[PDB]
Amino acid sequence: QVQLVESGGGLVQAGGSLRLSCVASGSAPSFFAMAWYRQSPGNERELVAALSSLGSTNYADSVKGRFTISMDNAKNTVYLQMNNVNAEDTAVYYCAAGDFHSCYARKSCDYWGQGTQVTVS
């Protein structure tokens, strides 16, 4: 069992930057993988960024070159750096996790955060 608690969202002006964070607690599986998803009003949830235990990353085409997913293992914290944000980035962001098989190479993550509102204006 893993628990995920997100922070760092809120309001931001277009063209600015913010950084979401999430703390993982519990007993993590081997080859622990984490990711960020998002969902805007009236739309389906979509993968934003995934990070494998060995450092591989995958990004949605709409955020490539602007967003970066990274980890501080000593703090059990994963990050979503969001640069040059635009109106299309407004959504509820969710952190998710699992292992390589369920959450990096497939979109079947086992564990989910509570969701954090980001609103760009």
């Binding site: 063209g15 600015g16 930057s17 913010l18 950084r19 640069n83 040059n84």
Partner: protein, 217 residues
Amino acid sequence: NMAIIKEFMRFKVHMEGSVNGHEFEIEGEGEGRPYEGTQTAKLKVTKGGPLPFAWDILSPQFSKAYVKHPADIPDYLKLSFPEGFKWERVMNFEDGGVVTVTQDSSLQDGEFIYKVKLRGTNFPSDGPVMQKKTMGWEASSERMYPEDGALKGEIKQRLKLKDGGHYDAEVKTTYKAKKPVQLPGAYNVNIKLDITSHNEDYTIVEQYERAEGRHST
């Protein structure tokens, strides 16, 4: 000089840098009165926000065309335009932190254009910069003197600390015009920089600075 540097001038600034490996970019717009020595700027963190370190180490890198000079002290840095000038700066902080800065100043289509690169290294992770425990700069006196075909400045620059006390840097800067213009003799510049407003995480910040030159002692 007085024809191209008007009594009111705007500027635009771009900074890219890293502090203890944390990368960021800032874009800013400023304005002021170059002959009266006053100016303001609004800065926005476009990449890497929020910064996990004190804004105060960045604020002195955002404008030497705006220094009030007496008539008998050549205003070397105003004389450098429209081509402009460049500067190189090392800040050695008293706990080992080091900030290096390079900057290009030019006049383009009626506005000053500033491009800054900054690298901060060696800041202790529990010190006041990385823990965001600084509370602004005290007034400074920059000792100016000509040397090796350029204008040198030296400052014992002092930050206030949130829980009491202060935190110093030894600062040395070389300012060099892109074309040979008249260098002054030795003199001092009195400077005060204030943070006038900021959002909660310092990704939008406004600054004000007054600077005036005068004869040594």
